[PDB]
């Protein structure tokens, strides 16, 4: 179901994740909860999702925002969606 | 003017002589509809009117 290469989208999303003040230093990879591993706040999570909105020209449902929790979940969501 | 040589404000003091009484009203006692509609006219002849007050109160 991967519309575009898994390596490219993961590299791009982690590149945008690095841009946030924290969420860096020793652990920027997969299996990292936004609020339980990276110290991100909920508003910071929403802003990062909007930055991915700018990067990948595709919208995210708000209920999906309630569902997304991890770096894996965001890349899976963006690869799944055909507009990508 | 009868106030030149006869000065007594307490007799003519209306500002500080107002008071408020207290009552308690209950739903158990029925309202008197006889007062409201017994005095109401039933025909044009029985109509009574309240005239407009010509002047507001003045001391004179």
């Amino acid at each position: 179901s991967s519309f575009l290469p898994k390596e490219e989208v993961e590299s791009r999303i982690i590149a945008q994740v690095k841009e946030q003040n924290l969420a860096a230093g020793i652990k920027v990879e997969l299996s990292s909860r936004f609020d339980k591993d990276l110290g991100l706040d909920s508003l910071d999570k929403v802003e990062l999702l909007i930055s991915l909105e700018e990067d990948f020209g595709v919208e995210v449902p708000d209920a999906e925002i309630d569902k997304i929790h991890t770096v894996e979940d965001a890349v899976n969501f963006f690869i799944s969606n055909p507009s990508s | 003017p009868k106030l030149v040589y006869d000065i007594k404000y307490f007799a003519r003091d209306y500002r500080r002589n107002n008071s408020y009484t207290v009552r308690s009203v209950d739903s158990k006692t029925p309202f008197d509809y006889s007062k409201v509609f017994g005095s109401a006219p039933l025909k044009p002849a029985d109509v009574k009117t309240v005239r407009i007050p010509e002047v507001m109160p003045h001391r004179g």
């Binding site: - | 404000y9 003519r12 010509e54 002047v55 507001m56 003045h58 001391r59 004179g60």
Partner: protein
């Protein structure tokens, strides 16, 4: 299996800014229009909000009268009248008959100037400029009466708690009576030029239609009520001065359109002339302000000759009178509608809360309902009939 029917969309969210041929003051009006027809009108006010209500709370009762003069620069006397009536009700002060007559007289005079300005500025907004200049000479004649009684042509501050500031100068009643002998002819001259004019008829008929139910629902008062068929006048239904003695007839129209309200305003001018004539003939002699010197200042010779009068003068011009704790709402039939003051007193020398009820606030709220389906040109006429003053709307 029956086809559905789609509809159309409205755009052109214009901004109609402060515009000189309109009701005086600054109006910012955002209008959403489907083509040339208005679908929503949202008046933006607060451009002349000077914080009047809160300033009153920091001043004594006598120090706050000029606020009411400046709330409505067109009709000063009627605006200060409600404030002084409310303070009188809380103070339980009785006004002498001469002062009551003077208040009624000057209220009718300011009513006439208000109606002159309303009608002629409305005609100017339509585009006729001759009645406007023909009217300023009359309005000057009336401003000279103001400058005679108070020394200020506009912000007299003549009405005071318990009576009037000074007595009528000698010779004033003759001049007012002469102005009255010629006023009817001047009004007839204006009425011929306006009434019966085909362009004026076409511009004003069936514009701004209001029904009696709509007027009561939106809280309108005065000419708006009387142009729709409502026989309601505060001067008659709820008299507040020697207005009860006065003999005059309510003008009534039924359509509710702009033309009906113009006719009502002209007839109101005539009725005010009749009331002025009655006041002139029946003007009593005696005190013009209340005899009580614990609420009104003593006369200057009296303060300069008596110790008690000097004490009262000092304590009235420094501290002011203390108004007993209570609340009251007193309304007057202002030329623009019903103007009321909700005064809350806690027993001090300053008002705790002085809410001002604007007659034009409800009319501007009614603007959207009235100005539905109209054109860009109709907005000026609709605003003219409401006759809104934005210093009066924005306290």
């Amino acid at each position: 299996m029956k086809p559905l029917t789609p509809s159309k969309v409205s755009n052109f969210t214009i901004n109609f800014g402060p515009q000189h041929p309109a009701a005086h003051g600054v109006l910012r009006l955002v209008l959403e229009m489907d083509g040339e027809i208005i679908k929503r009108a949202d008046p933006h006010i607060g451009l002349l909000h000077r914080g009047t209500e809160k300033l009153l709370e920091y001043k004594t009762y006598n120090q706050g009268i000029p606020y009411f003069d400046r709330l409505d620069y067109v009709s000063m006397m009627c605006m200060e009248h409600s404030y002084v009536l409310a303070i009188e009700q809380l103070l339980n002060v009785a006004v002498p008959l001469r002062g009551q007559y003077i208040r009624v007289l000057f209220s009718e005079i300011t009513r006439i100037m208000n109606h002159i300005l309303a009608i002629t500025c409305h005609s100017m907004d339509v585009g006729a400029l001759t009645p406007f200049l023909w009217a300023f000479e009359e309005r000057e004649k009336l401003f000279e009466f103001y400058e005679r009684v108070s020394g200020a042509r506009m912000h007299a501050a003549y009405f005071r708690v318990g009576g009037v500031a000074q007595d009528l100068p000698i010779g004033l009643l003759r001049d007012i009576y002469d102005w009255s002998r010629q006023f009817a002819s001047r009004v007839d001259e204006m009425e011929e030029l306006l009434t019966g004019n085909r362009i004026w008829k076409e511009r004003t008929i069936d514009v701004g239609l209001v029904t009696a139910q709509q007027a009561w629902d939106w809280g309108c008062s005065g000419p708006i009520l009387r142009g729709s068929g409502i026989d309601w006048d505060l001067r008659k239904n709820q008299p507040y001065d020697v207005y009860g003695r006065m003999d005059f007839n309510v003008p009534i129209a039924g359509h509710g359109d702009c033309y009906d309200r113009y006719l009502v305003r002209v007839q109101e001018m005539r009725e005010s002339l009749r009331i002025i004539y009655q006041c002139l003939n029946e003007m009593p002699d005696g005190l013009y302000k209340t005899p009580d010197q614990k609420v009104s200042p003593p006369s200057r010779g009296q303060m300069k000759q008596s110790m008690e009068s000097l004490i009262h003068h000092f304590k009235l011009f420094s501290e002011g009178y203390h108004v007993p704790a209570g609340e009251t709402y007193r309304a007057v039939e202002a030329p623009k509608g019903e103007f009321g003051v909700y005064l809350v007193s806690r027993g001090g020398n300053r008002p705790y809360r002085c809410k001002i009820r604007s007659p034009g606030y409800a009319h501007l709220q009614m603007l959207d309902m009235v100005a539905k389906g109209a054109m860009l040109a109709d907005v000026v006429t609709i605003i003219g009939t409401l006759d809104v003053v934005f210093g009066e709307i924005d306290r």
